[PDB]
Coordinates of C-alpha atoms and ligand atoms in Angstrom, one line a residue:
Chain A
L1 CA -6.8 89.7 58.4
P2 CA -8.4 86.6 59.8
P3 CA -7.8 86.0 63.6
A4 CA -6.4 82.5 62.8
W5 CA -3.2 83.5 61.1
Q6 CA -2.2 86.5 63.1
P7 CA 0.5 84.5 64.8
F8 CA 2.3 84.6 61.5
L9 CA 2.5 88.4 61.9
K10 CA 5.5 89.5 64.0
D11 CA 3.9 92.7 65.1
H12 CA 1.1 90.5 66.5
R13 CA 3.6 88.3 68.3
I14 CA 5.2 91.2 69.9
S15 CA 1.8 92.4 71.1
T16 CA 1.3 89.2 73.1
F17 CA 4.3 90.2 75.3
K18 CA 2.7 91.6 78.3
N19 CA 4.9 92.5 81.2
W20 CA 7.7 90.7 79.7
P21 CA 10.9 91.1 81.8
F22 CA 14.2 91.5 79.9
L23 CA 14.0 94.7 77.9
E24 CA 16.7 97.0 76.4
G25 CA 20.1 95.8 77.5
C26 CA 19.1 92.1 77.0
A27 CA 19.5 89.9 74.0
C28 CA 16.2 88.2 74.5
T29 CA 13.8 91.2 74.1
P30 CA 10.2 90.8 73.1
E31 CA 11.1 92.0 69.6
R32 CA 13.9 89.3 69.3
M33 CA 11.4 86.7 70.8
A34 CA 8.8 87.5 68.3
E35 CA 11.4 87.6 65.4
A36 CA 12.3 84.0 66.4
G37 CA 8.6 83.1 66.3
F38 CA 7.9 83.2 70.0
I39 CA 4.5 84.1 71.7
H40 CA 4.1 85.0 75.3
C41 CA 1.8 82.7 77.2
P42 CA 2.3 83.2 80.8
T43 CA 0.9 81.0 83.4
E44 CA 0.7 81.9 87.1
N45 CA 3.5 79.5 87.8
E46 CA 5.7 80.5 85.0
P47 CA 4.9 84.1 83.7
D48 CA 8.2 83.4 81.8
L49 CA 6.6 81.0 79.3
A50 CA 7.2 81.5 75.6
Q51 CA 5.8 79.3 72.8
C52 CA 6.7 79.1 69.1
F53 CA 3.5 79.8 67.1
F54 CA 4.6 77.3 64.4
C55 CA 5.9 74.2 66.2
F56 CA 4.3 75.1 69.5
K57 CA 7.5 74.2 71.4
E58 CA 7.2 75.7 75.0
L59 CA 10.3 77.2 76.7
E60 CA 10.8 78.9 80.0
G61 CA 13.6 79.8 82.4
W62 CA 14.7 82.4 79.9
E63 CA 18.2 83.9 80.4
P64 CA 18.9 87.6 79.5
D65 CA 21.9 86.6 77.3
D66 CA 19.8 83.8 75.5
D67 CA 19.6 84.3 71.8
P68 CA 16.0 83.5 71.0
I69 CA 16.8 82.0 67.5
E70 CA 19.6 79.9 69.1
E71 CA 17.4 78.6 72.0
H72 CA 14.9 77.8 69.2
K73 CA 17.1 75.8 66.8
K74 CA 18.5 73.9 69.8
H75 CA 15.3 72.9 71.3
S76 CA 13.0 72.5 68.2
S77 CA 15.5 72.0 65.3
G78 CA 13.0 70.6 62.8
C79 CA 10.6 73.6 63.0
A80 CA 9.9 74.8 59.5
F81 CA 9.5 78.5 60.7
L82 CA 13.4 78.6 61.2
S83 CA 13.9 78.0 57.6
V84 CA 11.6 80.8 56.4
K85 CA 14.1 83.6 55.4
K86 CA 11.2 85.7 54.1
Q87 CA 9.0 88.3 55.5
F88 CA 5.3 87.4 55.7
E89 CA 3.8 89.7 53.0
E90 CA 6.5 88.6 50.6
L91 CA 5.3 85.1 51.1
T92 CA 3.7 83.4 48.1
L93 CA 0.2 82.1 48.7
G94 CA 1.3 78.5 47.9
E95 CA 4.3 78.9 50.2
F96 CA 1.9 80.2 52.9
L97 CA -0.8 77.7 52.4
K98 CA 1.8 75.0 52.6
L99 CA 3.2 76.5 55.9
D100 CA 0.0 76.9 57.5
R101 CA -0.7 73.3 56.7
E102 CA 2.4 72.2 58.4
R103 CA 1.6 74.4 61.5
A104 CA -1.8 72.6 61.7
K105 CA -0.1 69.3 61.6
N106 CA 2.4 70.5 64.2
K107 CA -0.6 71.6 66.4
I108 CA -2.3 68.0 66.2
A109 CA 1.1 66.2 67.0
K110 CA 1.4 68.4 70.1
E111 CA -2.1 67.7 71.2
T112 CA -1.8 64.1 70.3
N113 CA 1.4 63.7 72.3
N114 CA -0.2 65.4 75.3
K115 CA -3.2 63.1 75.1
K116 CA -0.9 60.1 75.1
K117 CA 1.0 61.3 78.2
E118 CA -2.2 61.8 80.0
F119 CA -3.5 58.4 79.1
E120 CA -0.2 56.7 80.0
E121 CA -0.1 58.4 83.4
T122 CA -3.8 57.4 84.0
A123 CA -3.0 53.9 83.0
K124 CA -0.1 53.7 85.5
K125 CA -2.3 54.9 88.3
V126 CA -4.9 52.1 87.5
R127 CA -2.3 49.4 87.3
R128 CA -0.8 50.5 90.6
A129 CA -4.1 50.5 92.3
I130 CA -4.8 47.0 91.0
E131 CA -1.4 45.7 92.1
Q132 CA -2.1 47.0 95.5
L133 CA -5.5 45.2 95.6
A134 CA -3.5 42.0 95.1
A135 CA -2.3 42.0 98.8
Chain B
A1 CA 16.3 78.8 78.0
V2 CA 14.8 75.6 79.1
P3 CA 12.1 73.2 77.9
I4 CA 9.1 73.2 80.2
Chain C
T1 CA -6.6 78.5 55.0
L2 CA -9.2 81.0 53.7
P3 CA -12.2 82.0 55.7
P4 CA -15.7 82.0 54.0
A5 CA -15.1 85.6 52.8
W6 CA -12.0 84.7 50.9
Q7 CA -13.1 81.3 49.4
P8 CA -14.3 83.0 46.1
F9 CA -10.6 83.7 45.3
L10 CA -10.4 80.0 44.8
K11 CA -11.3 78.8 41.2
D12 CA -12.4 75.3 42.5
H13 CA -14.8 77.1 45.0
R14 CA -16.3 79.2 42.1
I15 CA -16.7 76.1 40.1
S16 CA -18.6 74.4 43.0
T17 CA -21.1 77.2 43.0
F18 CA -22.4 76.1 39.5
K19 CA -25.2 73.9 40.4
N20 CA -27.8 73.2 37.7
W21 CA -25.8 75.3 35.3
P22 CA -27.3 74.5 31.9
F23 CA -24.2 75.0 29.7
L24 CA -22.0 71.9 29.9
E25 CA -20.0 69.9 27.4
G26 CA -20.0 71.4 23.9
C27 CA -20.5 74.9 25.4
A28 CA -18.0 77.7 25.6
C29 CA -19.5 78.9 28.9
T30 CA -18.8 75.8 31.0
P31 CA -18.8 76.0 34.9
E32 CA -15.0 75.6 34.6
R33 CA -14.7 78.4 32.1
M34 CA -17.0 80.7 33.9
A35 CA -15.0 80.2 37.1
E36 CA -11.6 80.7 35.3
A37 CA -13.2 84.0 34.3
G38 CA -14.0 84.9 37.9
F39 CA -17.7 84.2 37.8
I40 CA -19.8 82.5 40.5
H41 CA -23.4 81.0 40.2
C42 CA -25.8 83.2 42.1
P43 CA -29.2 82.1 40.8
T44 CA -32.6 83.4 41.7
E45 CA -36.2 82.3 40.9
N46 CA -36.5 85.1 38.3
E47 CA -33.0 84.6 36.9
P48 CA -31.7 80.9 37.2
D49 CA -28.7 81.7 35.0
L50 CA -27.5 84.7 36.9
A51 CA -23.7 84.8 37.4
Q52 CA -21.6 87.4 39.1
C53 CA -17.9 88.2 39.2
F54 CA -16.6 87.6 42.7
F55 CA -14.1 90.5 42.5
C56 CA -16.0 93.4 40.8
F57 CA -19.5 92.2 41.6
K58 CA -20.8 92.7 38.0
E59 CA -23.9 90.5 37.5
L60 CA -24.6 89.0 34.0
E61 CA -27.6 86.9 32.8
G62 CA -29.0 85.6 29.5
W63 CA -26.0 83.4 28.9
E64 CA -25.8 81.5 25.6
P65 CA -23.9 78.3 24.8
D66 CA -21.2 80.0 22.7
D67 CA -20.6 82.9 25.1
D68 CA -17.0 83.3 26.2
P69 CA -17.0 84.4 29.9
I70 CA -13.7 86.1 29.8
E71 CA -14.9 88.2 26.7
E72 CA -18.3 88.9 28.3
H73 CA -16.2 89.9 31.3
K74 CA -13.9 92.3 29.6
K75 CA -16.9 93.6 27.7
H76 CA -19.2 94.4 30.6
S77 CA -16.6 95.3 33.3
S78 CA -13.4 96.2 31.6
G79 CA -11.8 97.8 34.6
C80 CA -12.0 94.9 36.9
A81 CA -8.7 94.2 38.8
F82 CA -9.1 90.4 38.5
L83 CA -8.9 90.7 34.7
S84 CA -5.4 92.2 35.2
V85 CA -4.1 89.3 37.3
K86 CA -2.2 87.2 34.9
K87 CA -0.7 84.6 37.3
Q88 CA -2.4 81.9 39.2
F89 CA -3.8 82.5 42.6
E90 CA -1.1 80.6 44.5
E91 CA 1.8 82.4 42.8
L92 CA 0.4 85.7 44.2
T93 CA 2.5 87.3 47.0
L94 CA 0.6 87.9 50.2
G95 CA 1.1 91.6 49.8
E96 CA -0.2 91.4 46.3
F97 CA -3.2 89.3 47.4
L98 CA -3.9 91.8 50.4
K99 CA -3.9 94.6 47.8
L100 CA -6.3 92.8 45.5
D101 CA -8.5 92.2 48.5
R102 CA -8.5 95.9 49.4
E103 CA -9.6 96.6 45.8
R104 CA -12.3 94.0 46.2
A105 CA -13.5 95.4 49.5
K106 CA -13.8 98.8 47.8
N107 CA -15.6 97.2 44.9
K108 CA -18.3 95.8 47.2
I109 CA -18.8 99.0 49.1
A110 CA -19.1 100.8 45.7
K111 CA -21.6 98.2 44.6
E112 CA -23.6 98.4 47.9
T113 CA -23.5 102.3 47.5
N114 CA -24.9 102.1 44.0
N115 CA -27.8 99.8 45.1
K116 CA -28.7 102.1 48.0
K117 CA -28.8 105.0 45.6
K118 CA -30.8 103.1 43.0
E119 CA -33.3 102.1 45.8
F120 CA -33.4 105.8 46.9
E121 CA -34.2 107.0 43.5
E122 CA -37.0 104.2 43.2
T123 CA -38.6 105.5 46.4
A124 CA -38.5 109.1 45.3
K125 CA -40.1 108.2 42.1
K126 CA -43.0 106.7 43.9
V127 CA -43.5 109.8 46.1
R128 CA -43.5 112.1 43.2
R129 CA -46.0 110.1 41.3
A130 CA -48.2 109.9 44.4
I131 CA -47.8 113.8 44.8
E132 CA -48.7 114.4 41.2
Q133 CA -51.8 112.1 41.5
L134 CA -52.9 114.1 44.5
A135 CA -52.1 117.5 42.8
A136 CA -54.7 116.7 40.2
Chain D
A1 CA -25.0 87.7 27.9
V2 CA -25.7 91.1 29.2
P3 CA -26.2 93.1 32.4
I4 CA -29.1 92.2 34.8
Ligands
LIG1 ZN1 9.2 76.7 66.2
LIG2 ZN1 -14.9 91.3 37.6

């Protein structure tokens, strides 16, 4: 299988979970995280960081009683992955192609929003500097 | 959990 | 999306391979008809009309206007798993597709194995002939 | 056609 669509595979998502806290006993296990579409992408700041592979919503501050699916609908309710009630290899090619398409769109919107924020913060610094010059 |  | 290796599963990609295909309107073996049959255009200098099934890797030449690619396919490679697929590519299950591709990966190994053996026999034939000439 |  191509490296690009591995995130669609639950077993692969589980694998990303390296030194994940919260194991047996907790509702937010790696297996339940992965089931919910989450991937482990730990920083150094927050080695607690989980990201949906489909909508790219990033969540941290995970609580052991948190239901991953429930944390997921709440924070990213429009995510199409949540509506997929089918296992991967039972997916139709048309259905899959159409999902991978929306995921690609989801990725751009996230990158686009990030760029917008960086630009706006840069703009605010410039303005401030110029305001200060007038004085 | 919480939104970064 | 499909990587370069899986593009041939797409009818429209196969169609796009046919460049300078002689048999167009009026003909039974149009690029579209060839592609629907699973063929891709893989021309050489020696054989400019050389076409090959993407799935079972059978190569056919000497195409004629009234040739029906499907029938030429069943005829020269009856066991091809692509022939059995009766539904469109996009209605295939991912499991089903992955099975088909396992068959295809095997078909390519088998084909590469046959070539290596044919080449091996060719080389041995030259050695024997050279031995005979020196035995004289 | 026929086999190469
Ligand atoms: Zn999501
Ligand atoms: Zn074939």
